[PDB]
Every structure is written in C-alpha cells, then in structure tokens.
Design a protein around this ligand. Sequence first.
Ligand code: A1BQN
Ligand code: ZN
Length: 139
Amino acid sequence: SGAIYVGNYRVVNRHLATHNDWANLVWEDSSRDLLVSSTTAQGCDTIARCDCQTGVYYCSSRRKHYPVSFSKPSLIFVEASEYYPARYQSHLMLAVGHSEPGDCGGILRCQHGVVGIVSTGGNGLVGFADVRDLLWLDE
Ligand SMILES: N#Cc1cccc(NC(=O)N2CCC[C@H](C(N)=O)C2)c1
Ligand SMILES: [Zn+2]
C-alpha cells in the first residue's frame, strides 16, 4: 500500500484504488496501473521533473529503504493477475531489488523529488510506475 499526496491530488496504484478514490476521480490509466483522485487537504509530497536513473525506494515487506539503478520508462510485458489480463504496462521502470505484491504503492525518490510508485516485481526485481511526465500534478 501507499500513495503520493501532491497539491489537491492523491496518486495510487489503480488496482488498489478505493470506492472514495473512484468517487473523486481525476484521471486513470489501466495501461500504467495509475489512478489520481482529488483531495480536500493540501498534500505533503513534491514531484521530480528529471531524467534520473538512480534513486531510493521504500520496501514495506522489509520496513527498509533501498538504493536502486532503474531503466527509463518503457512498455514492459506483465503477466495476468487477478486485476488485469496479460498486457504491456507502459511508463514502467525496472530495477534489481526486493519486492512482494503488498509492496505496491511504495515511493521511489531521487534528489529532485518523487519519481514513481512500486507497481510490479518478483524474483529479485522491482518495477515502478513513473509519474514524472504528469506535469498537471503541480499545475
Ligand atoms: N512478487 C511480486 C510483486 C512485487 C511487486 C509488485 C507486484 N505486483 C503485483 O502483485 N501485481 C498484481 C496486481 C497488478 C500489478 C500490475 N501492475 O499489473 C501486478 C508483484
Ligand atoms: Zn531526479
């Protein structure tokens, strides 16, 4: 679990969005596993606007942060799950690092701010959904 709180927006994994997220929907994209909902309170986070390929992510299944080197956002095949059919997930960055399904929502940050959230992984890999291209998150 986990979310990004920026301005009057909450960014979560689309497969973990709640009834309240869907009732206050701003934008969603099944291909990216992202959903953004509106909030009444101002949020705690800043979004990175950069091309960093190194950063640090939070891993809930270890209660620890890990440094990673990650690939540039791209289209990557993701096997079928209870939430989606087998498909290509876009804007996804891969890294070598521990992750389990419940780690989705953990934030990846670089020196410029939030880069994305955990969305895929397994077998010593972790995949992050990028948010750096969503310029409207800041206005
Ligand atoms: N093992 C593992 C693992 C680690 C981090 C994350 C995951 N992700 C998942 O559990 N899913 C199932 C729900 C939809 C997700 C999607 N992006 O299509 C993929 C697995
Ligand atoms: Zn950066």
